[PDB]
Amino acid sequence: DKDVKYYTLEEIQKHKDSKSTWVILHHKVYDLTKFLEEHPGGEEVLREQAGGDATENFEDVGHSTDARELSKTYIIGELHPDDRSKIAKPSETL
Numbered sequence: 665d666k667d668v669k670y671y672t673l674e675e676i677q678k679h680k681d682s683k684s685t686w687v688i689l690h691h692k693v694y695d696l697t698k699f700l701e702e703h704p705g706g707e708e709v710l711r712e713q714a715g716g717d718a719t720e721n722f723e724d725v726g727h728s729t730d731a732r733e734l735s736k737t738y739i740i741g742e743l744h745p746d747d748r749s750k751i752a753k754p755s756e757t758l
């Protein structure tokens with residue numbers, strides 16, 4: 665309802681295909697479907713992971729303050745509170 669868009673891991677994991685490039689960057693779900701080409705860094709790097717923990721890759725690069733605010737402009741919602749209370753630890757990677 666209501667609030668933000670609390671999406672579950674599995675749901676977000678569907679959103680990586682053809683044309684719904686979601687990513688989760690620090691507990692927050694961003695649709696970047698219309699940002700792919702705009703991204704001063706490119707579509708592919710975005711589309712590589714998609715529907716999942718692009719936090720790792722995002723923070724590897726670190727990203728500027730600008731990008732952080734610009735994330736908010738693309739914010740659709742958050743990780744479902746269920747998993748949020750228990751971010752039992754990702755199997756990892758890359």
Ligand code: HEM
Pocket residue numbers: 687689694696703704705706709710712713718719721722725727728730731732734735738
């Ligand atoms: C909320 C989503 C994101 C936003 C709003 C965003 C925004 C930006 C912005 C503004 C820059 C410019 C950096 C600069 O001026 O130095 C940038 C660069 C870049 N981003 Fe992102 N980004 C996002 C997610 C990602 C993710 C998840 C990846 C990796 C999978 C990625 C990889 C890169 C890379 C590699 C560059 C720089 C490439 C180069 O060296 O020229 N970004 N991003």
